[PDB]
Design a protein around this ligand. Structure first.
Ligand SMILES: Nc1nc2c(ncn2[C@@H]2O[C@H](COP(=O)(O)OP(=O)(O)O)[C@@H](O)[C@H]2O)c(=O)[nH]1
Length: 428
């Protein structure tokens, strides 16, 4: 978790999935015990049909939740005016040209990059549900054009091999968006694609300023989400090297504008945190440097202007703050409610087990007093009637002991869930 913060999410996901398997086993064991106890015709009922059916229903519910928990992931979504550099930023983070991001190109739809354990990339168009190959980035871009049905509300998933990008292997999904100016029905974008985003990145043009259409979208994000994690990349900052008489003053103005936006307008970060959310970068520099590095050549070959390493460190600082943020936030956001659910379900089963225990114990006490009163009713058959009473007392004592043991197992699950909560669900 010190090496790559995203392993925090990977490890949390493994742990809570494993707890849910143990919970399923426990509920299964309990259901079998209840069902056998309900069927016992040698005793007055110590359980009800409602308890049997409730516990079976909890098993069904827990197996459904396991299916959801297995698919949970971190999601970062990128927004900004066309040609600010969104696709280049994504490609830079993935160390490769995954999404089309060249000159003369515009992406008209949402693109969603997700890892696959497969050996080849491929495309999945949502809604239409067809699968196409994407062995090169020109082949992908060819596929987005020949699909005339794609519009600003469409989404195509790019399933990219895991072995290439640790980000993707560690359960991160990256979402690219059409230019922010393409529509004003931006409510639709948030409904469809953003409510499960753990981090939002505004990729702005550092050559100009934050556009009002860009800020307006993040006003709406703040309306829909509680303290959303918002980063601002002032991209294309290599251009500033061309205007050195302005660069430091322009940086100061941009920084104050962006800080005012996040702190005083949205109120989603404090002023002392703003330096960890706003960065001045050249995504094209980073991408080309990493492509060179990946192929075994100096990273300096990616430089577009004087000051390459300064801008590179700024992008690496962004990535570090990003991974620290998304891993901690997504673990809490994506697992807290199922953790609470698992505690409620375990408690309901514990309650049922304790009720069986009490009912058996009470019936056992009744038999023990019946046994002691036999001596006043029977002398010749006293020992046989006592021995028959003893058999029923032993069956009830066995039920009470087993029920008590299963009740106690619920406490083991609740303690595992509390330790998960302590390690992974504390607020920041
Ligand atoms: N000089 C410079 N060019 C960039 C930078 N980032 C992207 N570009 C170029 O700007 C054009 C648009 O970039 P792209 O990532 O496709 O923009 P998008 O529409 O926001 O996704 C492409 O030709 C990129 O290579 C940058 O930091 N500096």
């Amino acid at each position: 978790v010190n090496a790559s913060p995203l392993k925090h999410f990977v490890t949390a996901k493994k742990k809570i999935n494993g707890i849910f398997e143990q919970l399923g086993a426990y509920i299964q064991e309990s259901a079998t015990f209840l069902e056998d106890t309900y069927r016992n015709a040698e005793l007055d009922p110590v359980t009800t049909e409602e308890q049997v059916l409730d516990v079976k229903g909890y098993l069904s519910k827990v197996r459904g939740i396991s299916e959801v928990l297995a698919r949970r992931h971190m999601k970062v979504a990128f927004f900004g005016r066309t040609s600010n550099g969104k696709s280049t930023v994504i490609n830079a983070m993935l160390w490769d040209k995954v999404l089309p991001s060249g000159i003369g190109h515009t992406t008209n739809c949402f693109l969603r990059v997700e890892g696959t354990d497969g050996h080849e990339a491929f495309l999945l168009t949502e809604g239409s549900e067809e699968k196409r190959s994407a062995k090169t980035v020109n082949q992908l871009a060819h596929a987005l054009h020949q699909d005339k049905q794609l519009h600003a509300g469409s989404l195509v998933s790019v399933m990219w091999p895991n072995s290439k990008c640790p980000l993707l292997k560690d359960d991160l999904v990256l979402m690219d968006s059409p230019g922010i100016d393409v529509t004003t029905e931006l409510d639709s974008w948030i409904d469809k694609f953003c409510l499960d985003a753990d981090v939002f990145v505004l990729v702005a043009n550092s050559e100009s300023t934050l556009m009002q259409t860009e800020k307006h979208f993040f006003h709406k994000v703040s309306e829909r989400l509680s303290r959303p994690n918002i980063f601002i990349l002032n991209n294309r900052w290599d251009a500033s090297a061309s205007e050195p008489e302005y660069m430091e003053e322009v940086r100061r103005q941009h920084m104050e504008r962006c800080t005012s936006f996040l702190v005083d307008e949205l109120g989603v970060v404090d002023r002392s945190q703003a330096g960890d959310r706003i960065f001045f970068v050249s995504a094209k520099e980073v991408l080309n440097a990493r492509i060179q590095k990946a192929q075994g050549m100096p990273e300096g070959g990616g430089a577009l202007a004087e000051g390459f390493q300064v801008r590179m460190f700024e992008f690496q600082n962004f990535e570090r703050r990003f991974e620290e943020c998304i891993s901690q936030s997504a673990v809490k956001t994506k697992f807290e409610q199922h953790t609470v659910r698992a505690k409620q379900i375990a408690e309901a089963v514990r309650l049922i087990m304790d009720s069986l225990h009490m009912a058996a114990r009470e019936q056992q006490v009744y038999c023990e007093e019946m046994r002691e009163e036999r001596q006043d009713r029977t002398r010749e058959n006293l020992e046989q009637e006592i021995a028959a009473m003893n058999k029923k007392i032993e069956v009830l004592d066995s039920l009470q002991s087993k029920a008590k043991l299963l009740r106690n197992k619920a406490g083991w699950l609740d303690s595992e869930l509390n330790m998960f909560t302590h390690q992974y669900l504390q607020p920041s």
